[PDB]
Amino acid sequence: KIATASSARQADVEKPADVTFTIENV
Amino acid sequence: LSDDFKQISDPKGYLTYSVKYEDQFTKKDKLRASEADDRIVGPTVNLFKYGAAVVNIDLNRDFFDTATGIDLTKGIPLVQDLLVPIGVTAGAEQSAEYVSGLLMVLFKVMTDNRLVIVGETTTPMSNTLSTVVNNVLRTTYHNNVGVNPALLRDFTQVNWLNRDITNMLQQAGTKYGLGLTETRLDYVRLVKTIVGH
Amino acid sequence: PALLRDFTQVNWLNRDITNMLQQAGTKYGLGLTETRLDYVRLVKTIVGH
Amino acid sequence: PALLRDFTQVNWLNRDITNMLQQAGTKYGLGLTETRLDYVRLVKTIVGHALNIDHFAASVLNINLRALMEANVTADDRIKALQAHSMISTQFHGPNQG
Amino acid sequence: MLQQPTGGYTTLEQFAFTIRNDGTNATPTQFLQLLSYEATENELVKKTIPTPETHLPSARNVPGNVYIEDAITQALFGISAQNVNAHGYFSRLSALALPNTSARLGLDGVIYNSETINIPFYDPAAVANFAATYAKLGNASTPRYRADMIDIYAHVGLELAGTDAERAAGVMPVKRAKFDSWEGSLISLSRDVVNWKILAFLIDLCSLEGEALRAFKTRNRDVFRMMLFIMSTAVAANVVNRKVTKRVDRVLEYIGVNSMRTAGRTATITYDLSRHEFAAKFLQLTFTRWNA
Amino acid sequence: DDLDEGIRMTTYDQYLSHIRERLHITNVPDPIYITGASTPDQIAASVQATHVAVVLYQSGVINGPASTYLRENEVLVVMPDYYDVVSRFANANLQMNNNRYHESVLEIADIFDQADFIQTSDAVRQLRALMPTLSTSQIRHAIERIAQITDVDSTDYGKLTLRFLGTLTRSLKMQNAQIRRIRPDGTVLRYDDQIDIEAFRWSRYFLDELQLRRLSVGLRLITNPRIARRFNGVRIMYLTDDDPDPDFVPDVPEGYVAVQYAHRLFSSSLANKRNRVTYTHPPTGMAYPSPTGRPHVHMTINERAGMSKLVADNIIASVIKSNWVVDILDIEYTAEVMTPSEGYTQHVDAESIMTAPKGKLFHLQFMDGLLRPEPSAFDPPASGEDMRLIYPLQPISVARSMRAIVNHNEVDRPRGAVAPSSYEMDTGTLSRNGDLLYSPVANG
Amino acid sequence: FVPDVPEGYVAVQYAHRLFSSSLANKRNRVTYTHPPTGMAYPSPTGRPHVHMTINERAGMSKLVADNIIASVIKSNWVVDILDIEYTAEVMTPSEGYTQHVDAESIMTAPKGKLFHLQFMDGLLRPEPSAFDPPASGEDMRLIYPLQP
Amino acid sequence: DDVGIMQQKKPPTVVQSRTDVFNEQFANEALHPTTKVIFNGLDVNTEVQP
C-alpha cells in the first residue's frame, strides 16, 4: 500500500457553564 | 445584573498544538495502560502518537474565529478589509492582511470577557493511576484534560522523547501538575467558592 | 517622464533620468502636496495636488 | 509453572515455587530480554525474548538464527554464480556488491 | 559553568570512557590488549594530511537545542546514522566559535542559545577553541572541502595497530586484527562507544596546550584508539569469526584500509557515503590536532 | 563600551509626544535645558526635581564632566534633531562619532517610577512598525471595519451633520490625545486638579481598566516569535536536495562576491551575431553576454519592480549555469512545512517568484524529510540528481514544538528531532498579586 | 571546431570498475570513484574536472551512461568516445538542422552503427539589428568531432 | 532507520533527452526539488534473482 500523511489539532470543548440545582455544601 | 462576563467551562486557549503525522510509522508493541490513566493521559498520547513528524503551536482558530473575520489557514492571522487601499479593490492575498490579523487578535484578546467555572471533574482513586501520573495529578481534574507533552512521560513508545521529558521534568526548575491546586484565593467567596486548577 | 525611472528597459534613458532626479535642483512628486482645513469646521477644503 | 506464584489457590505449591524462585540459582523471566545480539541487523533487528518454550526448540531456533546471522552472503555471490552460468565476458550491473 | 581542570575535563570521573567486555565494564585500554595482528604483503604509508580549510560554516541561528554530541557520536559510531551532513547543527557549532556568543555547550552535549543557568556547561573559551575546529565538520559534504576518504585511514591504522617502532617509522604492514570475542562484539562495542561523552575529549584536545596537552595525549591514547577501532570495523572490507578451539576469534581484515563498503552487514556498523565523508573529515581534523 | 552603554538621547518630537505630558500631570518643573556651559550638579538637581533622567539639549558643545555625568547616570538628552550630533559634545576621548550610535526603543516605564500612567510597552510600537503609513481616510476605514466586526453602528461618527453644509467628515486620527480644558482664546490649559476632575488627568487611551489588563497579555501574544510566521526574503540557489530540515539556508561559498541588483548591471549587447542580455560585473567591469561562465556572485535583489522578463530569466539561468546565489529580499511569504508523504501540493515557477506583485503574500512549501525511511538494499541506483532552487532566508518552523516522534534504532534519537521546551511543561504557581509564574529555578 | 580540454582536467580511462551502486543519503546512487585519489563521488554535481576517455562502451550499464552524461552537464566532464563512427553534413544557416542525435544513442548503440551528425557552418548568419532587444536562451552543442 | 516497505512519495521526474544541439532556456523552471534524467527506459535491471 502507498505511504500516507495525516493531521490533527486539539479540539475546542468550551461550553457555557452548566446550571446545577444541587449543592456541594451546607 | 449586567452580563459583564461570559461564564464557561473547559476553556479554549489562544494557542493550540497542531500535528502532522507520517502514517507509515507505527510501533509494533501495543501499550496497554490503566483505563483511568488512559483517560487522563489519553488525548495527549493520541495527539503525539508515534510517527508524528511535526508538532507546531498555532493560534487557536476555534477561538480566533471567522466571526472575528480572521482566517488562519495560512498559519498566520489574516483580515479582509482593515488596512486597505482607498479608491480601489484591495486585491487577494495581500500581506497587509497579516498586520490586520494581529490587530484583530489583539482586539479579540483585549475584549475576552470569559470567566471559567469548573466543568465535569474526576477524582481518580490513585491506586488506579500509574505513579508518574499520580504525582502529576492533584486530587481532581477536568475530564477534558487537554494536551500537555509532560503526559507522554512513561507512555510514549518513542524512547528518546521519554528520556528527554523525564530529564526536564526531573529538574527542579520545572514541575508539571494537573488539576485542583491550592491557591491564595482558595476559600474566597463570590456567590460561589473560587478554586485553582 | 520621471515615472519611467527604473521601469524603462532603455538604459541610457533611465540613467539620464535618474541623473536628473538625483540633482538637488529638481525633484518630481505626484499627489496630495497640501491641505487646508477650515478654521471652524475643522474639515479640509483647498488641497494642492 | 513460575506464573502460578501468588495465583494458585493451592498453598503448598505457591510456597514451594516461591521458595525455588526466591533462591539465587533460579530466576524466571518473560519477554524482551537484553542480549549480546541486541542491535545487530539482518534486514531487520535481532532481539531476545524470554519465551515459555522447551530449551530444545529454543536451542534449535537460536542456532538457525545465528546461521542466518553468520552466513554473510551478498549480491556479489549471486553475480558471481550468475557470471559462471552466463556467456563469457557478459556483464552484470546489479546493486551494491555488498 | 564547569571550570576546566588543568588536566582537562577528561580527568573528571563524570567523563570516564568505558566499554563492556562480554558485558563486564572495562577501560578501553584493557580491551585493546585483547587485539592481536597478522601482517600481510601490502604496506601502509602515511603521507601528510592536507591542512583543513579555514572556512567555518556560517553561524546562522536555528530554532531549538542542537544535540551535537549525539550527532557526532552517531555519525561515527551509531548503527545506520542518518542526516549526518545536515547543516544546522554545525552552524550552531560555529556560533559557539564566536568570541562572545550567548550560546553554551551543556555537559549533556546539547547547545542552548539561552544562557540557561539551570544546566551546567563547559567554559566558553574552551568550546570556542573546540568549535573553531570542529564546526568544519559541516564542510564534510561540500565538494571543495571533502577529505581524502582513503589515505587518512593509513593514519588510523598506524595509531591503532601500529607498533611504537612503526609509529616512529610512519610505515607499517597492513594488518589483520583478531581477538577472543562474543556474539555481537563489534556492535556492542559501537554501542558502548556511541554513549561516550566525546566532547570532553575533543574540547580537551583543542583547549589544552603544552605539557597538560601532551599528558592528555598520553593519558587518552587508548580512548582515541577505540574510536579508531570502531571506525576501522566500519570500513574493514571483511569481518569473520574463526573457531579456534572452543573460543571464537573475531577477525577484521584489514586494519588501516578503507574498503569504501556501504551496504549493511551483520558484523559491524556500516558507513553510507555521507558517513564516509563525515568520518574522513573528522579524522582530518582530529589527526591534525593530535599531531602538534 | 557595550551597545547598551553610551549616552542616551531621543528626538524632541518623541519627548513631546510621550514624556512631556506625563511630566505635566506629575507636577514637576520642566526639565532644564543644557547649554553646554551647564554644571553636572545642575543636571543632578534637575533629575532630582523631575524624577526622570531627562534633560533637553539647548545649545552647542556640552562640557566633558557633564557629558560623563549624563553617561554614568543614563540621562536621556532630548536633541531637537539628529544632524551632526557629535558636534554638540566636546569629546576629549574623541571616540564619539556619528553612525556609532545604537538606535533602540525605550519603554516609558524604564524612566517613570509612576506606574499609574503607563498602559503599554515596546510591543505596540513594534506592531505599528509593521503598519503601512495611513492616510486619515484609511484610518477611518479601519475603525469602521473594527466597528463592523463588532456590530456597532458607526454611522455619523467623526462627522458633522449640518443642515445646510451637508454632512462633513473630520479626521479620526488622535493618538495620545487627552481631555484638557481650554482658554476662551481656544488654547489648551495644562491640567489642574484644583478645577478639572481627576478622571481627566490621563485618558488611558480611552480604554476600560480591564481592557488594559488584557491588552498587555495580547501584546505579549502578538510579539511572540511563534506567532510570527510571515517570512521575508528567499535565497535562490542551485543545490542538490540533501538537507532534511525545512529551515535550511545554504551558506554562501567563500569565493562569491556580493552584488546589489541594479537595472544598470544588465544591458543589450552584440555577441556572436545576437543581442545578448549582458551582465557587466562591478568589481572588474567585464561584460558577460552568456549566462554561463559568469563569476560567482551573491546578487541581492531588494526590489523586483521594473525588472525585465529577459533580465530575470537571465539571472535564473545564471543561478543554474554560473551557480549564482540570488537573494530576493522583497518576497513576503507564508511557509508550510510538509511531511515527506504529503509531497508538494502547491508549486512555484521561477518566473512567478520573480514576477509577483510587491505587496502580495506568497505561499511557499518546505519539506521536513527527517521521517523518510532508508531505501531498500536492492532498489535500483539513481543516475538522476534531484535539484532545488528556493530556500528560506530566515528560520521557518518558529512554531515548531516537537519533531520526529519516532525511534531511530529503538533507543537512539534521530538527528534533528526536537523535544518540547521545558516551559511548555512548567505549571508554576501564582505570584501574590495573581500573575502566572514559572517554577523557581534552583534556589532560592 | 574541436573544443580544447581546459587546463585543470585529469585524464581518466573508463572501466566498469570505476562506477558502482552505493548508498549515499537515503538513496542508492551511481557512484563514481576517481582513480587519482580513490574518492567516490555519489552525485554528478561535485565530480573533479575529468576528461574521460571511453574506448569501449560494450558492457557499459545504461545507468552509468546516464550518470556520465549528467557528469558532463553538471561537473563539466569532457568525455571522448572513440568507438563511434559517423558521416557528417555541414548545413548552411538558412538550411537549419534537419535532424538530431540523442546522447542516449551515442552512448548505447552497437559498435558498428554509422551515425550521421550535422554541423552548421555559421559564417553567413545574419547580424541582428542594433536596436532589436535580446532573446533569452542559449544555443548549445553537446557532441563534437575529435578530428576535422 | 528502517527500510521503507509501503511505496514512497517520490518527487516528480523530469526527463531531458539531450541532443547534439539544443536551445536551453530556464523560463518556467520548477523551484521544488525534482529529479532530472537524461535517458528514457532507465528501468534496466530486469533480471530478478530469487
mmCIF file of N, CA and C in Angstrom, chain F residues 238 241 313 316-317 320-321 340-341 344 346-350 373-376 383-387 389-390 407-409, chain H residues 1-5 8-12 16 23-24 26-38 42-43 45:
data_model
loop_
_atom_site.group_PDB
_atom_site.id
_atom_site.type_symbol
_atom_site.label_atom_id
_atom_site.label_comp_id
_atom_site.label_asym_id
_atom_site.label_seq_id
_atom_site.Cartn_x
_atom_site.Cartn_y
_atom_site.Cartn_z
ATOM 1 N N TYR F 238 21.269 26.825 -6.689
ATOM 2 C CA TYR F 238 21.063 25.583 -7.421
ATOM 3 C C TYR F 238 21.798 24.423 -6.776
ATOM 4 N N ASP F 241 19.046 18.455 -3.467
ATOM 5 C CA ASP F 241 18.166 18.455 -2.294
ATOM 6 C C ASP F 241 18.603 17.429 -1.253
ATOM 7 N N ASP F 313 14.989 36.082 -16.352
ATOM 8 C CA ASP F 313 15.226 34.747 -16.865
ATOM 9 C C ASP F 313 16.733 34.527 -16.979
ATOM 10 N N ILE F 316 18.178 33.831 -13.500
ATOM 11 C CA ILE F 316 17.888 32.448 -13.127
ATOM 12 C C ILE F 316 18.840 31.510 -13.849
ATOM 13 N N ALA F 317 18.998 31.764 -15.141
ATOM 14 C CA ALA F 317 19.911 30.987 -15.952
ATOM 15 C C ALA F 317 21.327 31.124 -15.421
ATOM 16 N N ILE F 320 21.665 28.765 -12.432
ATOM 17 C CA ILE F 320 21.839 27.394 -12.848
ATOM 18 C C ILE F 320 23.176 27.165 -13.554
ATOM 19 N N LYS F 321 23.537 28.076 -14.448
ATOM 20 C CA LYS F 321 24.724 27.925 -15.287
ATOM 21 C C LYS F 321 26.021 28.476 -14.699
ATOM 22 N N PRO F 340 7.118 14.256 4.327
ATOM 23 C CA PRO F 340 7.514 13.666 3.039
ATOM 24 C C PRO F 340 6.401 12.932 2.312
ATOM 25 N N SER F 341 5.495 12.314 3.052
ATOM 26 C CA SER F 341 4.408 11.594 2.410
ATOM 27 C C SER F 341 3.336 12.481 1.765
ATOM 28 N N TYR F 344 4.535 17.837 -2.367
ATOM 29 C CA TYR F 344 4.367 19.264 -2.586
ATOM 30 C C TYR F 344 3.073 19.554 -3.340
ATOM 31 N N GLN F 346 1.474 22.335 -3.693
ATOM 32 C CA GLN F 346 1.407 23.656 -4.315
ATOM 33 C C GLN F 346 2.762 24.090 -4.886
ATOM 34 N N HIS F 347 2.780 24.368 -6.189
ATOM 35 C CA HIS F 347 4.018 24.586 -6.934
ATOM 36 C C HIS F 347 4.322 26.028 -7.357
ATOM 37 N N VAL F 348 5.587 26.284 -7.698
ATOM 38 C CA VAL F 348 6.066 27.642 -7.966
ATOM 39 C C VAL F 348 7.195 27.724 -8.994
ATOM 40 N N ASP F 349 6.869 28.250 -10.171
ATOM 41 C CA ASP F 349 7.849 28.503 -11.220
ATOM 42 C C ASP F 349 8.793 29.605 -10.773
ATOM 43 N N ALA F 350 10.016 29.596 -11.295
ATOM 44 C CA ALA F 350 10.959 30.677 -11.026
ATOM 45 C C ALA F 350 10.401 32.008 -11.536
ATOM 46 N N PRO F 373 12.264 6.996 5.510
ATOM 47 C CA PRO F 373 12.899 5.699 5.760
ATOM 48 C C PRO F 373 13.919 5.337 4.682
ATOM 49 N N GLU F 374 14.956 4.600 5.060
ATOM 50 C CA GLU F 374 16.043 4.268 4.143
ATOM 51 C C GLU F 374 15.585 3.421 2.953
ATOM 52 N N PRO F 375 16.248 3.586 1.798
ATOM 53 C CA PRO F 375 15.978 2.790 0.598
ATOM 54 C C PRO F 375 16.321 1.328 0.825
ATOM 55 N N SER F 376 15.603 0.426 0.167
ATOM 56 C CA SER F 376 15.902 -0.996 0.273
ATOM 57 C C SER F 376 17.272 -1.249 -0.328
ATOM 58 N N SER F 383 20.686 7.280 -11.245
ATOM 59 C CA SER F 383 21.590 8.140 -12.016
ATOM 60 C C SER F 383 21.202 9.629 -11.983
ATOM 61 N N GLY F 384 19.911 9.910 -11.835
ATOM 62 C CA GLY F 384 19.437 11.283 -11.850
ATOM 63 C C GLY F 384 19.760 12.027 -10.570
ATOM 64 N N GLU F 385 19.768 13.354 -10.637
ATOM 65 C CA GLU F 385 20.054 14.163 -9.460
ATOM 66 C C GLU F 385 18.899 15.108 -9.142
ATOM 67 N N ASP F 386 18.211 14.864 -8.029
ATOM 68 C CA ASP F 386 17.161 15.775 -7.584
ATOM 69 C C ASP F 386 17.781 17.122 -7.221
ATOM 70 N N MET F 387 17.141 18.202 -7.653
ATOM 71 C CA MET F 387 17.719 19.535 -7.528
ATOM 72 C C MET F 387 16.725 20.505 -6.923
ATOM 73 N N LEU F 389 15.946 24.919 -5.890
ATOM 74 C CA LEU F 389 16.259 26.326 -6.104
ATOM 75 C C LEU F 389 15.891 27.251 -4.928
ATOM 76 N N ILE F 390 14.669 27.133 -4.421
ATOM 77 C CA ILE F 390 14.164 28.058 -3.411
ATOM 78 C C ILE F 390 14.523 27.634 -1.989
ATOM 79 N N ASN F 407 11.373 6.422 16.772
ATOM 80 C CA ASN F 407 12.655 5.975 17.277
ATOM 81 C C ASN F 407 13.654 5.738 16.166
ATOM 82 N N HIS F 408 14.852 6.293 16.306
ATOM 83 C CA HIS F 408 15.978 5.868 15.482
ATOM 84 C C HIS F 408 16.604 4.682 16.184
ATOM 85 N N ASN F 409 16.554 3.513 15.557
ATOM 86 C CA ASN F 409 17.177 2.318 16.123
ATOM 87 C C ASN F 409 16.715 1.981 17.541
ATOM 88 N N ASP H 1 15.134 4.610 10.763
ATOM 89 C CA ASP H 1 16.302 3.933 10.229
ATOM 90 C C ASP H 1 15.923 2.719 9.358
ATOM 91 N N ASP H 2 14.711 2.205 9.549
ATOM 92 C CA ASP H 2 14.260 1.003 8.854
ATOM 93 C C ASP H 2 13.969 1.249 7.379
ATOM 94 N N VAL H 3 14.253 0.257 6.542
ATOM 95 C CA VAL H 3 13.967 0.357 5.115
ATOM 96 C C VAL H 3 12.460 0.443 4.890
ATOM 97 N N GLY H 4 12.034 1.326 3.989
ATOM 98 C CA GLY H 4 10.618 1.514 3.730
ATOM 99 C C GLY H 4 10.032 0.326 3.002
ATOM 100 N N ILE H 5 8.728 0.120 3.147
ATOM 101 C CA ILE H 5 8.060 -1.010 2.507
ATOM 102 C C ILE H 5 6.860 -0.519 1.711
ATOM 103 N N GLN H 8 6.802 4.719 -1.502
ATOM 104 C CA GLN H 8 7.091 6.066 -1.011
ATOM 105 C C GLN H 8 6.707 7.183 -1.971
ATOM 106 N N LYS H 9 6.512 8.379 -1.428
ATOM 107 C CA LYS H 9 6.175 9.550 -2.238
ATOM 108 C C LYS H 9 7.420 10.231 -2.812
ATOM 109 N N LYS H 10 7.842 9.779 -3.986
ATOM 110 C CA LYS H 10 8.981 10.345 -4.707
ATOM 111 C C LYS H 10 8.644 11.670 -5.412
ATOM 112 N N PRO H 11 9.612 12.599 -5.471
ATOM 113 C CA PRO H 11 9.484 13.836 -6.258
ATOM 114 C C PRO H 11 9.347 13.540 -7.755
ATOM 115 N N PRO H 12 8.621 14.391 -8.499
ATOM 116 C CA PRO H 12 8.380 14.163 -9.931
ATOM 117 C C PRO H 12 9.674 14.128 -10.749
ATOM 118 N N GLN H 16 15.055 14.922 -19.552
ATOM 119 C CA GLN H 16 15.546 15.819 -20.581
ATOM 120 C C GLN H 16 16.426 15.028 -21.517
ATOM 121 N N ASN H 23 18.434 24.336 -27.738
ATOM 122 C CA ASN H 23 18.351 25.648 -27.132
ATOM 123 C C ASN H 23 17.907 25.547 -25.688
ATOM 124 N N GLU H 24 18.849 25.503 -24.750
ATOM 125 C CA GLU H 24 18.457 25.510 -23.339
ATOM 126 C C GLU H 24 17.917 26.869 -22.911
ATOM 127 N N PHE H 26 15.561 28.586 -19.303
ATOM 128 C CA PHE H 26 15.088 28.237 -17.972
ATOM 129 C C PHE H 26 13.910 29.078 -17.516
ATOM 130 N N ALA H 27 13.100 29.507 -18.475
ATOM 131 C CA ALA H 27 11.806 30.080 -18.159
ATOM 132 C C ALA H 27 10.949 28.966 -17.581
ATOM 133 N N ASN H 28 10.111 29.309 -16.605
ATOM 134 C CA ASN H 28 9.166 28.359 -16.033
ATOM 135 C C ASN H 28 9.847 27.126 -15.425
ATOM 136 N N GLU H 29 11.044 27.318 -14.878
ATOM 137 C CA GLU H 29 11.733 26.254 -14.153
ATOM 138 C C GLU H 29 11.054 25.960 -12.813
ATOM 139 N N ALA H 30 10.980 24.685 -12.442
ATOM 140 C CA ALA H 30 10.454 24.302 -11.133
ATOM 141 C C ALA H 30 11.404 24.726 -10.020
ATOM 142 N N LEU H 31 10.853 25.143 -8.885
ATOM 143 C CA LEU H 31 11.679 25.522 -7.743
ATOM 144 C C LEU H 31 11.741 24.420 -6.694
ATOM 145 N N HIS H 32 10.712 23.581 -6.673
ATOM 146 C CA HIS H 32 10.670 22.435 -5.781
ATOM 147 C C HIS H 32 11.689 21.429 -6.260
ATOM 148 N N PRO H 33 12.177 20.578 -5.350
ATOM 149 C CA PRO H 33 13.121 19.549 -5.783
ATOM 150 C C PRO H 33 12.470 18.676 -6.841
ATOM 151 N N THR H 34 13.235 18.285 -7.857
ATOM 152 C CA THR H 34 12.700 17.488 -8.959
ATOM 153 C C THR H 34 13.807 16.742 -9.681
ATOM 154 N N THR H 35 13.781 15.409 -9.629
ATOM 155 C CA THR H 35 14.861 14.620 -10.233
ATOM 156 C C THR H 35 14.872 14.757 -11.744
ATOM 157 N N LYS H 36 16.065 14.913 -12.303
ATOM 158 C CA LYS H 36 16.211 15.126 -13.734
ATOM 159 C C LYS H 36 17.054 14.004 -14.314
ATOM 160 N N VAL H 37 16.604 13.419 -15.420
ATOM 161 C CA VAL H 37 17.343 12.301 -16.002
ATOM 162 C C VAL H 37 17.477 12.413 -17.512
ATOM 163 N N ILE H 38 18.628 11.995 -18.028
ATOM 164 C CA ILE H 38 18.948 12.206 -19.438
ATOM 165 C C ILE H 38 18.345 11.140 -20.360
ATOM 166 N N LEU H 42 15.064 3.846 -18.421
ATOM 167 C CA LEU H 42 16.146 3.636 -17.471
ATOM 168 C C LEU H 42 15.844 2.520 -16.465
ATOM 169 N N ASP H 43 14.679 1.887 -16.590
ATOM 170 C CA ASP H 43 14.349 0.731 -15.751
ATOM 171 C C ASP H 43 14.993 -0.541 -16.317
ATOM 172 N N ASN H 45 17.248 -2.896 -14.864
ATOM 173 C CA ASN H 45 17.584 -4.078 -14.062
ATOM 174 C C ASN H 45 16.450 -5.094 -14.002
#
